[PDB]
Design a binder for this molecule. Structure first.
Ligand SMILES: Nc1ncnc2c1ncn2[C@@H]1O[C@H](COP(=O)(O)OP(=O)(O)OP(=O)(O)O)[C@@H](O)[C@H]1O
Ligand SMILES: Nc1ncnc2c1ncn2[C@@H]1O[C@H](COP(=O)(O)OP(=O)(O)OP(=O)(O)O)[C@@H](O)[C@H]1O
Ligand SMILES: [Mg+2]
Ligand SMILES: [Mg+2]
Lengths: 161, 107, 106, 161, 54, 54, 53
């Protein structure tokens, strides 16, 4: 009964033909959504490089300092106040700008790195003030040496000035 | 050890004036025997008797548990003669706890 | 767990297994004073086998033992051997703990 | 009255015919959603192998070390700064990369494992810094020996180097 | 941990070491009591300066 | 930090210094105990007023 | 849960639960009249919707 009667019953209603066509629409939509996910995963795994730096490593401080120095003409900065002792002997206020949280683009070594200042999420961390801040280096390519060169340059600049 | 029921444990004590080579000899021996060194601080603040037993039960294999400067954990001499062996530390460790952890029923 | 001895411990307000079942220590491996082990084993076994004698007289069905002596004479070892002999488990309790209270002890 | 009157009333409206066909569409969509769940559950139960490693085991550290070593050319790494003592007697910074959280794919023993670094969720744990981080080993197949070989190799490498 | 992750080419400076612990009379006395604010011990400092993990 | 971030052209004012730590008898005694409420020590104050990072 | 009525009603619900098939376990030690104590498996209806007559 469930097989034969329903086939006749569905065929009796012309709206079932419209409805069954809508079933294909739903199936295609689900397949399209799944197709996006697999494509994104494959593209990220095969053609993109990602480097995350947590705030529990001194590399975070070095990389933050290097980003503050080499930021090109970035227009998404944030302020940072400090006192600079002049060679004259007195001390005056120093206004230093650090790139504010967001997505920023650089042109280091001919590529387009997509550095991103991760913001505070739950105010939990160790060895710091517990903001859990991080930076992610995203770029298109397969070679890993660009990020290592960035880290070495950051260390050199930290040892510099 | 097994054929006679003796627990399969052992302990060593190195005592003397400072600067004679206790820690250096322990490091050299650990290197010679291809063992690792488990640095345990008796006078910690988070160390309790149950924690001490658990730590002495989960020590890595082929390792030497190292209790350095044992005399600093608990009072001695005058207090040793006195009825309580007071724990001059920061945590919640007691003399009986250490005694049972080193050689007890669950060791 | 047979052929071995299980040792519990105080985890919060319940008894939980501590580590793995330790291997039994043979009773004869512990050499006490002449006949002391036999006396203690006889007493504890007679207590275990006779609950009716306690119930019919209203006496609470409990028993406790005390072993006292200079250190290194064989108290803890004998307790382990006796637990192995009676196939019982050992519930270690630390009176001088930090989380232990009267209600928790009860 | 509710039976006879409504059927005549429903038959009066031609939009009910379209509406009643839409009821079949709604039932089919609910059936379609249910079919996905049972199919996924059966597929996971019969054709996939899963091994979760919590943060409360030494196996977690061993497996993390083995994953850091055997990561192929993974481009989703995270930095880790350490001091390495050279045989010359001095110490220099060691830039070590550990795969950043995400979906990583390996080709161990001719299969395609889907190792994934579970991230911090509520910052609650014991015997650690309380990150509640974990790794999940997922693969297509029925044999359990792949993960056992991975764990044994991880222990051997931990005893190595 | 702090003495093990000191930045390379640096001088660790423990200034006014005498104030960390009691001295003289208490040094002759059995315990070297830590008259500080934290959870530091004389054995811990001795091991950190020169021990097995130094 | 507070002595290192004082506003320019300002006079840091430590009023009634003698109440911070014990004196006289305790000054002759080996420890200069801190008779306050917080986590400040005599050696820390000495290094802050004139030390390495001043 | 702040009233003794809560405990009494919980006990009565555990006792008179008809053939409820959504129970939860509750382990307790029961002293037999023989002088020994054995494990007692007692089931309490698990949270949810239950129907009585
Ligand atoms: N027998 C020895 N041979 C070589 N060096 C030695 C010897 N004894 C001591 N030393 C040297 O003394 C220094 C520290 O020694 P060590 O830490 O072993 O002494 P200790 O007083 O036993 O230590 P601790 O305070 O840790 O108990 C090192 O430089 C070590 O090389
Ligand atoms: N009668 C005995 N027969 C065999 N071994 C014994 C005996 N007495 C002591 N030992 C040995 O002494 C060691 C420790 O014994 P044990 O822990 O029982 O002593 P204790 O002083 O009663 O202990 P505790 O400090 O726990 O009170 C073990 O190696 C054990 O084998
Ligand atoms: Mg030494
Ligand atoms: Mg004993």
């Amino acid at each position: 009964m469930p097989f034969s009667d329903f086939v006749l019953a569905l065929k009796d209603n012309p709206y079932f033909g419209a409805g069954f066509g809508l079933v294909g629409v739903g199936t295609a939509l689900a397949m399209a959504r799944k197709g996006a996910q697999l494509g994104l995963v494959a593209f990220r795994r095969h053609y993109m490089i990602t480097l995350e730096v947590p705030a529990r490593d001194r590399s975070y401080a070095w990389l933050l300092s290097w980003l503050t120095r080499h930021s090109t003409r970035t227009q998404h900065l944030s302020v940072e106040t400090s006192y600079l002792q002049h060679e004259s002997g007195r001390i005056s206020t120093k206004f230093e700008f650090i790139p504010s949280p967001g997505n920023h683009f650089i042109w280091y070594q001919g590529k387009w790195i997509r550095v991103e200042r991760n913001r505070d999420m739950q105010m939990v961390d160790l060895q710091t003030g517990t903001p859990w801040e991080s930076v992610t280096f995203t770029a298109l390519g397969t070679d890993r040496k660009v990020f290592f060169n960035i880290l070495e340059e950051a260390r050199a600049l930290a040892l510099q000035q | 050890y097994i054929d006679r029921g003796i627990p399969y444990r052992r302990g060593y004590l190195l005592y003397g004036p400072p600067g004679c080579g206790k820690s250096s000899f322990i490091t050299a021996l650990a290197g010679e025997l291809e063992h690792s060194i488990c640095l345990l601080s008796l006078t910690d603040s988070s160390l309790s008797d149950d924690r001490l037993n658990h730590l002495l039960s989960v020590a890595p294999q082929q390792s030497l548990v190292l209790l350095e400067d044992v005399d600093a954990a608990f009072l001695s001499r005058d207090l040793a003669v006195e009825n309580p062996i007071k724990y001059q530390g920061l945590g919640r460790l007691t003399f009986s706890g250490l005694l049972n952890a080193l050689d007890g029923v669950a060791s | 767990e047979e052929g071995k001895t299980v040792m519990y411990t105080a985890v919060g307000s319940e008894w939980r297994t501590f580590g793995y079942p330790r291997r039994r220590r043979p009773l004869d491996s512990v050499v006490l004073q002449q006949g002391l082990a036999d006396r203690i084993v006889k007493d504890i076994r007679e207590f275990i086998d006779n609950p009716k004698w306690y119930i019919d007289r209203g006496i609470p069905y409990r028993r406790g033992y005390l072993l006292y002596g200079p250190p290194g004479c064989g108290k803890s070892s004998f307790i382990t051997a006796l637990a192995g002999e009676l196939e019982h488990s050992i519930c270690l309790l630390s009176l001088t703990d930090s989380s232990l209270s009267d209600d928790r002890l009860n």
